[PDB]
Design brief:
Helix content: over 70%
Shape: rod-shaped
GO biological process, one term: establishment of competence for transformation
Subcellular location: Secreted
Keywords: Competence, Pheromone, Secreted
GO molecular function: pheromone activity
Number of strands: 0
Strand content: under 5%
Number of helices: 1
Function: Acts as a pheromone, induces cells to develop competence for genetic transformation.
Order of helices and strands: H
Amino acid sequence: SGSLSTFFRLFNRSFTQALGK
């Protein structure tokens, strides 16, 4: 489950994109 894959990926992507920056 988990998954978590989707959740983990989403969190990482969102954090990286938000930080971004």
